[PDB]
Amino acid sequence: RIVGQYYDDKTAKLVRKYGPGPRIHYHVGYYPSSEAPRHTRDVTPDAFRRSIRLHQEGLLRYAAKIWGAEHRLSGRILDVGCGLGGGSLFWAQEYGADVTAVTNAPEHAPIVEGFARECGVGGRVRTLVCDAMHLPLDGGPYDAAVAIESSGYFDRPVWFERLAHVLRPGGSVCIEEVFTTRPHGADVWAEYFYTKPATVLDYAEAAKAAGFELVDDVDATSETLPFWEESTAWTKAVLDSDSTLSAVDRRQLRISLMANQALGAEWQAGGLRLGFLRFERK
Amino acid sequence: RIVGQYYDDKTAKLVRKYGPGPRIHYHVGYYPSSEAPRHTRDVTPDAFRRSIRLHQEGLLRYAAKIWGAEHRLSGRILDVGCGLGGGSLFWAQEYGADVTAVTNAPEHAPIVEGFARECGVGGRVRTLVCDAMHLPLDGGPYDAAVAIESSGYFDRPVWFERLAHVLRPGGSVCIEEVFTTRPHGADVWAEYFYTKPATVLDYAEAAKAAGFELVDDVDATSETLPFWEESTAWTKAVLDSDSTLSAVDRRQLRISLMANQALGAEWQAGGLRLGFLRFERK
Amino acid sequence: RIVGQYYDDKTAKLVRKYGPGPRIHYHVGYYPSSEAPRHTRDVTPDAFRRSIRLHQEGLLRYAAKIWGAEHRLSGRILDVGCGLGGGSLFWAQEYGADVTAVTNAPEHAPIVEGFARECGVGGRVRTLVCDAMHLPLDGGPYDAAVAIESSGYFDRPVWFERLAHVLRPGGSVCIEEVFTTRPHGADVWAEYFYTKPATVLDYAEAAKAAGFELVDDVDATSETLPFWEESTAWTKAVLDSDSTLSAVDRRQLRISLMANQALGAEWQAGGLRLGFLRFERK
Amino acid sequence: RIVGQYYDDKTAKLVRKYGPGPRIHYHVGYYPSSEAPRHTRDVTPDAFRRSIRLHQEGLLRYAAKIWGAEHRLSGRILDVGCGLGGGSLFWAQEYGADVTAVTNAPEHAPIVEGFARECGVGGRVRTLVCDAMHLPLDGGPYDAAVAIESSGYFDRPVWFERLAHVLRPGGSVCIEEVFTTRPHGADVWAEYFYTKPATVLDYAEAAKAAGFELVDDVDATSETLPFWEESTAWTKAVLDSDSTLSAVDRRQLRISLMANQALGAEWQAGGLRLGFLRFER
Amino acid sequence: RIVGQYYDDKTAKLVRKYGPGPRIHYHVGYYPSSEAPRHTRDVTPDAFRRSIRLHQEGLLRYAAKIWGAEHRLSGRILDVGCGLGGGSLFWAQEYGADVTAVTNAPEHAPIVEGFARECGVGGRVRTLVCDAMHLPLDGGPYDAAVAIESSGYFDRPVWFERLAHVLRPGGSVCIEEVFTTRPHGADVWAEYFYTKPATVLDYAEAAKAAGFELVDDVDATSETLPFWEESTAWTKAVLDSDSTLSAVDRRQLRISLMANQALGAEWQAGGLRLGFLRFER
Amino acid sequence: RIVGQYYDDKTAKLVRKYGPGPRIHYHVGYYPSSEAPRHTRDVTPDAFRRSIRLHQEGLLRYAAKIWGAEHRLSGRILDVGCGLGGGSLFWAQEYGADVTAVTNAPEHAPIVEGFARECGVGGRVRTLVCDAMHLPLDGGPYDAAVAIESSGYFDRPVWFERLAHVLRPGGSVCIEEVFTTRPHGADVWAEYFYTKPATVLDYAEAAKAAGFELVDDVDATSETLPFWEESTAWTKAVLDSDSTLSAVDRRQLRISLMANQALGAEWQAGGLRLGFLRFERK
Numbered sequence A, B, C, F: 001r002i003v004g005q006y007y008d009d010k011t012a013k014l015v016r017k018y019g020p021g022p023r024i025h026y027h028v029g030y031y032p033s034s035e036a037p038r039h040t041r042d043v044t045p046d047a048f049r050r051s052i053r054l055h056q057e058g059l060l061r062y063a064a065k066i067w068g069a070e071h072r073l074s075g076r077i078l079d080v081g082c083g084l085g086g087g088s089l090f091w092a093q094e095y096g097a098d099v100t101a102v103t104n105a106p107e108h109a110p111i112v113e114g115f116a117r118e119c120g121v122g123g124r125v126r127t128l129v130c131d132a133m134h135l136p137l138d139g140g141p142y143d144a145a146v147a148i149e150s151s152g153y154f155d156r157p158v159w160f161e162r163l164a165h166v167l168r169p170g171g172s173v174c175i176e177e178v179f180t181t182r183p184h185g186a187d188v189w190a191e192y193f194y195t196k197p198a199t200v201l202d203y204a205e206a207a208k209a210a211g212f213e214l215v216d217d218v219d220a221t222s223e224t225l226p227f228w229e230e231s232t233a234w235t236k237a238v239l240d241s242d243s244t245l246s247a248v249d250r251r252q253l254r255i256s257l258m259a260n261q262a263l264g265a266e267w268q269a270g271g272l273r274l275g276f277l278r279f280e281r282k
Numbered sequence D, E: 001r002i003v004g005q006y007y008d009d010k011t012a013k014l015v016r017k018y019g020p021g022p023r024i025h026y027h028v029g030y031y032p033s034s035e036a037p038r039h040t041r042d043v044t045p046d047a048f049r050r051s052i053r054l055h056q057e058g059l060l061r062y063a064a065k066i067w068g069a070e071h072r073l074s075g076r077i078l079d080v081g082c083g084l085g086g087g088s089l090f091w092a093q094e095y096g097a098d099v100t101a102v103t104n105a106p107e108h109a110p111i112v113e114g115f116a117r118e119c120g121v122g123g124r125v126r127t128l129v130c131d132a133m134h135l136p137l138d139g140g141p142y143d144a145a146v147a148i149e150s151s152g153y154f155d156r157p158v159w160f161e162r163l164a165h166v167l168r169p170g171g172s173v174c175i176e177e178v179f180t181t182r183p184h185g186a187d188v189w190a191e192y193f194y195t196k197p198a199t200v201l202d203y204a205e206a207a208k209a210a211g212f213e214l215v216d217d218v219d220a221t222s223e224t225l226p227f228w229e230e231s232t233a234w235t236k237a238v239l240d241s242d243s244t245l246s247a248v249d250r251r252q253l254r255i256s257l258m259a260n261q262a263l264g265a266e267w268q269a270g271g272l273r274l275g276f277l278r279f280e281r
């Protein structure tokens, strides 16, 4: 949709906040203690940035553990909604996977190829720019598909049909996602990020219809709540310190801070769930 | 029922361990800090008994909070799988509910009424020896059903259907239960307690087919883990201190001790969720 | 006897787990390398059953070696606490002994004679339902008594006195047993098996007061530890593979699994010795 | 200075609260689960003092764990700001260390010595009534120096210079202290106890300039916050229980309660950090 | 030399014993409990080959554990004396490494390449038909070099010199080998397999003179002694089972049995050590 | 007896073999794996010496663990049969004990005071030269007594009476010792070292008579067997390498080697037991 233009235009802010390096993640970070680190020695934007980065990697490491990526994500896999390729390179390098990276933000694909060349995995990571519900996917059967915080953009009934045609029997669909637990329980997240979160039931119903079984359903809501404290704290540090900010840039950072507070309030209100689902194709 | 007789044989040990009347609870306790109490001066059996009982009440006090017991559990309710009446009297005394307590252990029904009479609520607490998913009940339409750690013995598709007919529109089904998060994630729990734990997804599927919306899905695994520490230390204390135990009782307590360690381990292993659900009748 | 009835109720599970006749053993197996067998290709229940049985025979073959069974256990012997006859037939068949097998489980006496008859040794193996430390036995003086993992149920001061009268000068008492090495070092063993383990010192004191010299005190704790690995893996295999198990049997097997881990832990903790003793009558 | 006299004056009000032991401790307690014990039906002053003393002892056990006192704190050590000798005796008895206990409260020195004898380690524990930033180096090189809640009273640069000359190479300097995490973050603590708390960076800079390497930094703010609830409860239990309290001591106790209430609020406000540090020479 | 031709000749007798996989291994097996599996009622040649292949694979899993192949063996590495490529493929597949596989048996090079494709790592595994002590350094610096049972064929000083120029600083050199523990301790092994086994000290001296630091030394003699019992059993199972064996191959098999019997006796005589070593540049 | 003159005269050989340093032990070493280390890089006498020394320290560390020396051996204790003070300094320094070191070899006491001064524990370690069964012991009640491989020289009935007068109630007697398990089962050890080993029963009988209870009985026979391989190997290395040996010194080393082989053969023949006993005064 317009979401590809919305993801295009914030390329600059993502590299500012979640860069640099070759692996830039754009998803919430995982704090296995449900507590944000205390930042004392160093309260500059770069301190929160590196802490956000490290715990965003912690999210991937945690997922590969509970999903047993050693055998389930080491083969030929789809990285649906790849962002800037942080996840894509993570599977390619940590588990040797051959990755097809999918995005509807064209500005992003060349960045992912750059970063893959960079780490030397350009022969095992490929991008393609299309909608993930209409994608023609040459590349034979894939052993798995991973969606880190992108399935909220998808039509789930139709998306799971798509994956049923391109995933071999017994292949996995691994989803990290914001879900509702009550109705409207993720509205702040939904309206601000142009997503349409549903319940875990909705995902399971749509996946069952296309021939997938739910084999794992993990609640990481409490372990990802600290991400909003760090995300907020970073935004405050930039506003507080950098005096080269134009009035326009300063207002976007302000709007980002205002949103991070309302998102963090929602996260703990009990109406949403940060989940890790894994489906197996029947 | 084999398990109905299993519950009858438990009464004496249930009464000794979960303390005297009038409210005797047979569920896990709720430790809001996810820390076990440090019993530093007094490590007697009665000291762990009291702490276990205090937090078993806390479970109910907590559940009353998240479920809005003041309007949702203050009317004509079903208390399904009622144990020795602890939850029955709680709802009847703390929220004025008219409680119909259901159980398949005949030995327990007179116990509960003898305790309801003692508390001056004998006219608003009656029992029904019963299979939860079978009887007609001519108690007119019901405002709510509560099931605290009993629904694991039930055929959830059939049980929700029963409830659909006896519950009024918008009436609630409130569940505290051990669910699986992946297949086999509660095998110790299942085989030791004759229980058939299922995933929260299955509960939602079964309740939907019967006409119920899931409107709340709270986690409390880490807040109930300290209960296994406390229950293990009670059993250790009794084995260490009580020298008037028959070899038969001592063996049961040694067995209970082994079970409590396996259960506490399983609580931590990730395959298991202690959650609170609330459904609403369409 | 409460424990006599406990042994009667065990027969079916004893027969299933410790393999079919004619020699059915109910003691720990003896692994001379203190290593458990690596079952690399076949991890079926029957594969662990066979290995357990092979090493249960090895226990007897080992004990025959260290005890000089050729001259010491080839005559008129008592086999006290005889189980299902495994040891009885071993001594009768491998060393030509005339065996009087003693037990307090009435269900087991016909089992043993049906197996002695099948092996053509029915005239040199008779049973005696009995308390070990009570009956008169008019089997004339005896050359030896053997007690393989049964003496833990006995009053050792009284039991050695009985034996002193029915044994001839220089006759041997051969014991394999779980002893304590410090108080409480075998509490799991004791409470789960209704047993009263004592230190080797107590056995020596009791046997001295009755007229017996201790002439051999062998350790075999580390050589019998692998048995708990094997017994645990058998139980795991049955739970994993056998889908026709009643909830009752499944629960017993889940309980046995928990017990086997606690026992294997206790075997390693230092409070416990699996030893072989030989006494000689003065 | 006036501080050494300030410690002299509160000797009796401090043996009442934290005594009698032979080990009296004057530092916060360590609650490993980060919550105070629920106190049963005994809510008397002695019930709370016993709990306070318990977790005070636990703080030293925990410091001894993370510092590996087995090797690092079992030799010839300085106990810098020994209070009433509770920490000094601890190292002497639990780790077979020889301890030189430094204080600027001359009244406390006899009390530490008397208690060293009654424990039978008087031949392993001597006192030094002096300023910590002017330590007699006659007495040979020391293995380590430990400062439990005393270093907020020190000129850190100067103190670490003194330590650089009395401590062998590789010697450890083990510190438990209230640090700041931001400016004015420990002002209630500072202005009430006459300390100058500084950040962890300040401490590492001063240690560096004297040849010391920061090798360990543990945050124990959460685990010591309940001390203020037990310390507040004890005070309330005293005002509530004994009606044979003079108006003057009843007002001193009251002021301590208001202080404990202000101190515990600042402990959770974010601006402060109860930390454990170790430097190597 | 004559060795490279000696490896060429035994290609068929070695695919028979240790194939077919796509991973064929030519090193002893690792039996972590130090005893061979009791073989049931299936005592056929394939039953033993499967067991031999199992613990051969386990040796590489165990080496990967103690070497931490996650970081050290997951980059651009040399597989020095790659045999039929079983170890090469292992590092490519299990640790996402890029592998240059060196051998002096030219017949083995196609077999390693063919198997690299069939596993889909042919773009991560190239071969080098050359002498290990004359390695082409064009091909950029390597992260590590691994030598599973090949270094007994090497001039260690010269080989480590070559390694010092092709390996980045901090690069690892991971060796599994038969070492001597005393003079003549591996003579059966040496004279049968055309090797010159040396002690661990010899290896560390030669590595040092080329700038390498010995950082790990594990003794696995006990855990690899059962390989000779399984290897002997397999041979017996073949002589016993198939009566359509030519006299010539029946005599070659017989000689291998006498060899395995002499080799396993020397493995327990004390004079030899199956070891795992790691050097850092 | 003459044993003090026998212990005097081998002062030279003990320092040669088990020195130097301040802690020289003269007891068997403890190898927790029951396997002697493989010595390959370095097979000189000094390699075996240091390995013997290290595992002799391992014996003390193991004993303080199973005896909980932190509270049981940190007080005022008797080190009966102190040798050259290795054990004495170990308790004084590792657990802060105040040690009275007893010996009948006067040449040895000044060596122990030297080594105590040396380590700075001269104020907490004192020697006295007398027979351990007639010793006047001023020094109030002692909290414990330790005997590492010396009680074989003592009259056990009489020695335990002595300890009953000087040990406070609840104090420990900690014995490491060679014991017989069969008669004559330690004859090689006994005749060569002028000891009179008895059974564990004999020790318990004598200790019970003077008011002690046996609370711990550990079998370390298998863990100390490797000591004879190292002790032999050292003796061979000295004979093999050192060419400055006189014919007399070379014959004593030969005689020592011949004895170490016969002692090592006895150790595994099953007739002796290397034990760690702990008695508590009633």
Ligand SMILES: Nc1ncnc2c1ncn2[C@@H]1O[C@H](CSCC[C@H](N)C(=O)O)[C@@H](O)[C@H]1O
Pocket: A001, A003, A004, A007, A024, A025, A026, A027, A080, A081, A082, A083, A084, A085, A086, A087, A102, A103, A104, A105, A130, A131, A132, A133, A147, A148, A149, A150, A153, A154
């Ligand atoms: N309809 C659609 N089809 C394909 N990709 C879409 C899409 N809508 C949104 N996306 C992509 O989904 C991603 C959401 S955030 C990126 C997630 C990334 N895997 C990470 O965690 O690092 C963006 O890359 C966005 O471009």
Ligand SMILES: Nc1ncnc2c1ncn2[C@@H]1O[C@H](CSCC[C@H](N)C(=O)O)[C@@H](O)[C@H]1O
Pocket: B001, B003, B004, B007, B024, B025, B026, B027, B080, B081, B082, B083, B084, B085, B086, B087, B102, B103, B104, B105, B130, B131, B132, B133, B147, B148, B149, B150, B153, B154
């Ligand atoms: N099939 C069935 N039908 C109705 N009740 C059942 C049942 N199977 C088990 N139960 C009941 O469910 C309860 C299990 S635990 C007791 C729960 C109680 N609400 C408490 O927390 O104190 C017992 O009352 C048991 O008798």
Ligand SMILES: Nc1ncnc2c1ncn2[C@@H]1O[C@H](CSCC[C@H](N)C(=O)O)[C@@H](O)[C@H]1O
Pocket: C001, C003, C004, C007, C024, C025, C026, C027, C080, C081, C082, C083, C084, C085, C086, C087, C102, C103, C104, C105, C130, C131, C132, C133, C147, C148, C149, C150, C153, C154
């Ligand atoms: N009081 C008693 N008198 C006689 N036998 C007893 C007894 N108590 C228990 N036993 C027996 O002791 C045995 C325990 S285990 C079975 C042991 C058997 N020798 C074997 O190893 O196969 C059982 O036969 C049990 O019936």
Ligand SMILES: Nc1ncnc2c1ncn2[C@@H]1O[C@H](CSCC[C@H](N)C(=O)O)[C@@H](O)[C@H]1O
Pocket: D001, D003, D004, D007, D024, D025, D026, D027, D080, D081, D082, D083, D084, D085, D086, D087, D102, D103, D104, D105, D130, D131, D132, D133, D147, D148, D149, D150, D153
């Ligand atoms: N300038 C100074 N020189 C030496 N000691 C000082 C000092 N200023 C304060 N102190 C001492 O440092 C201690 C602070 S509080 C006491 C801490 C003690 N280790 C305990 O935990 O119990 C007091 O003994 C105080 O007298």
Ligand SMILES: Nc1ncnc2c1ncn2[C@@H]1O[C@H](CSCC[C@H](N)C(=O)O)[C@@H](O)[C@H]1O
Pocket: E001, E003, E004, E007, E024, E025, E026, E027, E080, E081, E082, E083, E084, E085, E086, E087, E102, E103, E104, E105, E130, E131, E132, E133, E147, E148, E149, E150, E153
């Ligand atoms: N001089 C030399 N240069 C390079 N490779 C050599 C060599 N001499 C022997 N080799 C090779 O080293 C290997 C020895 S055995 C094969 C080892 C292999 N890593 C495996 O475990 O399967 C053979 O491939 C042999 O051809």
Ligand SMILES: Nc1ncnc2c1ncn2[C@@H]1O[C@H](CSCC[C@H](N)C(=O)O)[C@@H](O)[C@H]1O
Pocket: F001, F003, F004, F007, F024, F025, F026, F027, F080, F081, F082, F083, F084, F085, F086, F087, F102, F103, F104, F105, F130, F131, F132, F133, F147, F148, F149, F150, F153, F154
């Ligand atoms: N009758 C006796 N009275 C006191 N000591 C004796 C004795 N007979 C032998 N000893 C002493 O007992 C010791 C035996 S060996 C020394 C053991 C020492 N604790 C160690 O393990 O390091 C010698 O010191 C010897 O002199």
